[PDB]
Amino acid sequence: GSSGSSGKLLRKQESTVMVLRNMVDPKDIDDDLEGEVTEECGKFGAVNRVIIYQEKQGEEEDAEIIVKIFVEFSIASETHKAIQALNGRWFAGRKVVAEVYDQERFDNSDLSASGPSSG
């Protein structure tokens, strides 16, 4: 028993969504990648879902293209681990950077922006 069946504590809502960057160019992105990243994350903990978002961040016609890989886990703890580790992992001839995303905004499907801005 947990000294109670229903109720809530003064605990906060940690972020369980890790965002990988500098993983792989937008060219390697294939139907296989997703799976590869999924099985690779399985190590840390139970992978809830993965979201791949990419876009242009330069006015130039052929500017650079970044890649934002979101990895949602079952719990915050697990996510923290993958981050504390992948936060400086070594990729096959490249460097990996795992940052912590914002759950608050993650509540909705607003990637480009954060939260539904009044206007």
Task: Give Cα separations from 42 to 19, 35, 72, 79, 93 (angstroms).
Answer: 15, 11, 11, 11, 23
- Kindly state whether residue 5 falls inside one of the protein's structural domains: no
- Kindly state whether residue 94 falls inside one of the protein's structural domains: yes
CA atoms within 13 A on the CB side of 59: 0
What is the secondary structure of 16-73 as a DSSP string?
-EEEEESSS-TTT--HHHHHHHHHHHTTTS-EEEEEEEEEE--SSTT--EEEEEEEEE
Of 9, 15, 5, 12, the C-alpha closest to 106 is: 15
Residue 26: CB atoms within 10 Å: 11
Task: Yes or no: say if 52 and 69 are a contact pair by the CB < 8 Å rule.
Answer: yes
- Kindly state whether residue 66 falls inside one of the protein's structural domains: yes
Burial code (b: 16+ CB inside 10 Å, e: under 16) for 84-110 equals eebeeeeeeeeebebebbebeebeeee
Structure-determination technique? NMR
- Kindly state whether residue 82 falls inside one of the protein's structural domains: yes
Task: Write the CATH number for 27.
Answer: 3.30.70.330
Of 15, 39, 18, the C-alpha closest to 96 is: 18
Q: Which residues pair with 69 in a beta bridge?
A: 20, 52
Q: How many domains does the chain have?
A: 1
Tell me the one-letter amino acid at 48: N
- Kindly state whether residue 58 falls inside one of the protein's structural domains: yes
